[PDB]
Amino acid sequence: RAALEELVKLQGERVRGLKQQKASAELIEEEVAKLLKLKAQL
């Protein structure tokens, strides 16, 4: 679980960084969808 929690924490910081970098809205969707996928496993 701790290994899976590490993935969610990291992916959640991925979508944050991309927001700070003012990346496109399309990219944010994809990465939020990744986080959603990971959260469903926890």
């Epitope: 003012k22 496109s24 809205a25 399309e26 939020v32």
Partner: antibody
Amino acid sequence: QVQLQQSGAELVRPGSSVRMSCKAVGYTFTDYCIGWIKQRPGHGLEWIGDICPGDAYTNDNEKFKDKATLTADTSSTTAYMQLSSLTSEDSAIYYCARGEEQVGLRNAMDYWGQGTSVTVSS
Amino acid sequence: DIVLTQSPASLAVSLGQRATISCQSQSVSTSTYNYMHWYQQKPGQPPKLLIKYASNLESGVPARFSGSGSGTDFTLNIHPVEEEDTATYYCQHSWEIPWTFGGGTKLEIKR
């Protein structure tokens, strides 16, 4: 209940600086960004900037670069906006509103404060 | 910045009839989501979110309100129109920084 509790109306002189507060309760403070919106007659609504508490960063509007400064205090779950070099054009009602989830999609602003009227006059 | 053009600027609709408010801009939609939102603001009150993501009705908001469209064109619909619906209606995008609002549409109830 989610509530955004803003500070009272302010009367301030031109050239001075003002600082208003936004107390947010009923939800996890660091999971959402908070938007600031300017409303004065004849200009509708205008987005000033977003504050994203926790590891605090801001989403900036270039038109408010040196005019507005957005900060936050996580412990008291309060967002602050400071308006400097005040002119008559800064006379408006200012709302804070809970925006997007920090790790979620781009979003609208659902929960709004009752607004803080700022009068710039001598 | 992204310009949101609303039409009409003001509108007068009779009781029980339909109100149609339009918002035009550049494409603020992906292939999955439409990042246009609708607000209602009555006098002396803060604006209230009606619709998010073009067509999702906020809980507590009457079914008389509805939204549609994608990409460059979005429409707000009110049917049937009631006396308490007199207000200014705004569209807003959450596509890219900065977020901007439409000019607003002042809805008058006709009697």
